[PDB]
Amino acid sequence: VIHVTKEVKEVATLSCGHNVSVEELAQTRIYWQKEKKMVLTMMSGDMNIWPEYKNRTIFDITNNLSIVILALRPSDEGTYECVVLKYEKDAFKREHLAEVTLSVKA
Amino acid sequence: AEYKNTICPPRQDYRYWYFAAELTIGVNYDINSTIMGECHMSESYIDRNANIVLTGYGLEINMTIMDTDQRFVAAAEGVGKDNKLSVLLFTTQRLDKVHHNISVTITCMEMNCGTTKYDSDLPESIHHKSSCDITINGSCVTCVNLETDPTKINPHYLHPKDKYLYRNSEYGMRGSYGVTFMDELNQCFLDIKEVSYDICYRE
Amino acid sequence: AEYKNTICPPRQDYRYWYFAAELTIGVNYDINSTIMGECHMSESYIDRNANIVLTGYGLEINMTIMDTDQRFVAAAEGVGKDNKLSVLLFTTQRLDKVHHNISVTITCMEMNCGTTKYDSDLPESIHHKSSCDITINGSCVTCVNLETDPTKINPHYLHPKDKYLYRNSEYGMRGSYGVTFMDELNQCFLDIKEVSYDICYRE
Numbered sequence: 001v002i003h004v005t006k007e008v009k010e011v012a013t014l015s016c017g018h019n020v021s022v023e024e025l026a027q028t029r030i031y032w033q034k035e036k037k038m039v040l041t042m043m044s045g046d047m048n049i050w051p052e053y054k055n056r057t058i059f060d061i062t063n064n065l066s067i068v069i070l071a072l073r074p075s076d077e078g079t080y081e082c083v084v085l086k087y088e089k090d091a092f093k094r095e096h097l098a099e100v101t102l103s104v105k106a
Numbered sequence: 107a108e109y110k111n112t113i114c115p116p117r118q119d120y121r122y123w124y125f126a127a128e129l130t131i132g133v134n135y136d137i138n139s140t141i142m143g144e145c146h147m148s149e150s151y152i153d154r155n156a157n158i159v160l161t162g163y164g165l166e167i168n169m170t171i172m173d174t175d176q177r178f179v180a181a182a183e184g185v186g187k188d189n190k191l192s193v194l195l196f197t198t199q200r201l202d203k204v205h206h207n208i209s210v211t212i213t214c215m216e217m218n219c220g221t222t223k224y225d226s227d228l229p230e231s232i233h234h235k236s237s238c239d240i241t242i243n244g245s246c247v248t249c250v251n252l253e254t255d256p257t258k259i260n261p262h263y264l265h266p267k268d269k270y271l272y273r274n275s276e277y278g279m280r281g282s283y284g285v286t287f288m289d290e291l292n293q294c295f296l297d298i299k300e301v302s303y304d305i306c307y308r309e
Numbered sequence: 310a311e312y313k314n315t316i317c318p319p320r321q322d323y324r325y326w327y328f329a330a331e332l333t334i335g336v337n338y339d340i341n342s343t344i345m346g347e348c349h350m351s352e353s354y355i356d357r358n359a360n361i362v363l364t365g366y367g368l369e370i371n372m373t374i375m376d377t378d379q380r381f382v383a384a385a386e387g388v389g390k391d392n393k394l395s396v397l398l399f400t401t402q403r404l405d406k407v408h409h410n411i412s413v414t415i416t417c418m419e420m421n422c423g424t425t426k427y428d429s430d431l432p433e434s435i436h437h438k439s440s441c442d443i444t445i446n447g448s449c450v451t452c453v454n455l456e457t458d459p460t461k462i463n464p465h466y467l468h469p470k471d472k473y474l475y476r477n478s479e480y481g482m483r484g485s486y487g488v489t490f491m492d493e494l495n496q497c498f499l500d501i502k503e504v505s506y507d508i509c510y511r512e
Contacts (some may be wrong), residue, residue: 002277029291031291036295041291044265083231085286085292088226089222090224090287091226091285091286091287092285092286092287092292093226093228093229093284093285094228094231094282094283094284094285094286094292095229095231096231096232096234097231097232097282098232099232099277135325136325136473163344214317215317215318215327216315216317216320216323216324216325217317217402218402219314219315219316219317219318220312220313220314221312221315222310223312245312245314280417298495
């Protein structure tokens with residue numbers, strides 16, 4: 001679902017669209033970003049959420065590496081991209097890229 | 107006697123360009139700014155294979171598209187911050203809507219020269235319907251990013267005066283390949299509007 | 310198929326210079342000041358040996374680095390006080406952190422010519438991990454001092470406009486060889502910021 005539209009204050013769900021077994025998360029880095037403003041990082045099990053989204057961000061690995069933002073705000077409208085990288089021998093290889101756009105009606 | 111589209115004949119000056127792909131290479135030696143006349147390019151459409159070789163800024167880039175009706179017509183190079191090199195590639199029009207396998211070979215010629223440091227296959231991230239055979243000869247590259255059929259990128263910058271320029275607008279034709287050799291994130295992105303580009307010289 | 314660094318391919322005009330060494334030679338005949346076009350240089354990377362021959366100011370200097378992955382790319386000469394001649398040598402980048410044996414032959418061409426006045430092996434003073442085979446044909450040299458991988462010396466002086474210049478910052482790679490033929494102290498030092506250097510012409 002490239003385009004998702006939710007009303008203000010509702011629950012926003014964005015699916016990275018890729019399923020990764022819990023076994024390989026150590027050899028995987030997952031980045032959710034929004035127009036080159038980092039949102040969430042899962043570097044080899046070490047997580048990190050930026051201040052703009054630390055309070056209202058839930059990351060679900062099982063559900064297609066999806067994220068949930070509660071209490072949608074008018075300034076959160078934009079395009080979000082999910083990138084998954086696998087640690088191959090002496091390199092980090094991008095194994096999936098997904099782009100999703102969220103619009104807020106007010 | 108059934109109709110089928112075919113590639114346009116060769117010429118000397120192609121006035122119709124298509125934004126085929128965008129390549130950003132990050133290097134661990136110093137490149138300062140764009141230099142006029144630095145880049146030199148050669149091209150060949152043999153069989154249904156298209157091949158471009160570019161020399162400049164201490165790198166040789168050999169890019170091939172496999173089983174294609176396109177032909178390479180132009181390339182431009184530019185340099186941005188943090189030793190980033192951007193290569194814009196322009197082919198003839200795209201006839202069929204099918205992803206093609208790519209082969210990229212990057213060789214270092216001025217700094218950190220060596221033998222084959224990397225050789226692998228990169229899946230197409232968005233659709234997983236193609237692949238890029240990446241080969242790197244040297245210890246000079248830190249990241250490679252390949253965008254086939256760019257959409258967001260605006261190739262009009264210094265739009266050449268006498269030519270026509272076309273760009274993809276569908277999200278289903280996008281393709282994104284990439285590898286990063288550094289512990290940090292890929293960070294192989296760079297803004298197009300902050301790069302000063304120069305057309306490569308055919309020879 | 311194990312990766313190993315290799316020397317960069319030859320070119321016509323190099324742009325990435327490395328401050329290989331500094332050589333100071335004091336003479337007992339008169340030299341006034343620098344002359345634009347006095348020095349002429351020749352270079353050869355044969356086997357793993359690098360060789361440079363410089364002709365100017367009444368001297369011929371034949372310097373050789375043995376079993377190295379470097380190549381000589383440039384040299385500059387300048388005339389200081391009390392008939393002191395300074396030679397700045399620039400090679401390609403350094404790959405391994407190993408001290409290389411050096412050979413230096415100084416021949417007089419205009420004053421105090423002769424046969425082989427000196428032939429000896431100077432130890433590396435700081436670390437004693439290399440040696441310099443010094444040969445002197447003539448009676449014109451009072452002192453000689455070779456500084457390999459200088460740190461304190463600043464090679465930026467008239468930094469060439471279109472090049473890049475690198476230098477060693479580690480004390481562990483410094484090397485200092487020297488011989489004085491006069492009853493006084495070596496006194497072969499000369500300040501860099503008081504010598505009007507000029508680039509030797511390749512031929």
